[PDB]
Design a protein around this ligand. Structure first.
Ligand SMILES: *[C@@H]1O[C@H](CO)[C@@H](O)[C@H](O)[C@H]1NC(C)=O
Lengths: 101, 101, 101
């Protein structure tokens, strides 16, 4: 019943994380429940994003919810296209058709 | 010497013109050689302690002698195919000359 | 006193790699040389650059010469900014001030 998911949140994004916790309560059913793994990081540093994305991939997550900056967006899209990891994000749409986004 | 090299060995090299991307590559090697040469001249060692390990090391461990290699590279001032070559503290070309034709 | 160096070259960059091999011959010394590990890779794929950059760091290189695209440029700059690895490139200048470039 435990579904492991990855969570990447910027350090200056509090309300954006508060709404995530509310969604976990409002949509928590009795059949199963999601188990988020949060790692607060600097979204602009693409090394921190690369290091944090692989931290979720090693822990065997089934999906990742995060953000990206201009200095990282291509890091997320290319890693998710190769490892076929699904990535959900409320940031700006990708400049083109990128799968697993 | 360029237009004399055998095209079977070095592809795209027996012509009398060289790309600006290719020429900067040749001038790049001169900067690298003069950097390590000045490190041997200024009497300091850059040899590694052991295995660098995994890049995703947590916490991120940056080697100390890497900042000496950066200081040597940006202080290189030689003459190459791109004219006068010298760098600032960031790594951008300065005192350079762009011919207008 | 051989000094090992990382070499990232795109697939179609044949003349650029030729001038790189010429640069070593014209600038190699009897006291020290350059030992490059050449990873021919697709420059646009950020994961390929990330996996190739770590392939050079695990091998213990003292500097890396390569290229980058609009997509993977921010991957190199941040990876070198945290690991203190020097990166040398003839690609377009970074839109801003990024160290170890
Ligand atoms: C700047 O470049 C010019 C042209 O090569 C050169 O004459 C001059 O010496 C350089 N400046 C310094 C401080 O070396």
């Amino acid at each position: 019943n435990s579904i492991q998911i990855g969570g990447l949140f910027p350090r200056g994004a509090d309300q954006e994380y508060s709404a995530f916790r509310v969604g976990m309560v409002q949509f928590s059913t009795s059949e199963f429940r999601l188990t988020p793994h949060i790692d607060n990081l600097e979204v602009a540093n693409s090394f921190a994003v690369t290091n944090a994305f692989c931290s979720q991939f090693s822990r065997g997550v089934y999906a990742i919810f995060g953000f990206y900056d201009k200095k990282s967006v291509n890091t997320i899209t290319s890693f998710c296209g190769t490892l076929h990891v699904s990535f959900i994000t409320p940031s700006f749409p990708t400049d083109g058709t990128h799968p697993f986004v | 010497r360029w237009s004399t090299l055998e095209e079977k060995e070095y592809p795209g090299a027996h012509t009398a013109t060289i790309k600006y991307t290719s020429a900067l590559t040749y001038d790049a090697v001169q900067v690298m050689t003069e950097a390590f040469r000045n490190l041997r001249k200024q009497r300091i060692e850059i040899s590694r302690r052991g295995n660098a390990g995994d890049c995703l090391a947590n916490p991120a461990v940056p080697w100390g002698q890497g900042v000496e290699i950066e200081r040597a590279l940006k202080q290189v001032q030689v003459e190459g195919l791109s004219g006068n070559i010298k760098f600032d503290q960031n790594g951008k070309r300065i005192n350079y000359t762009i011919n207008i034709m």
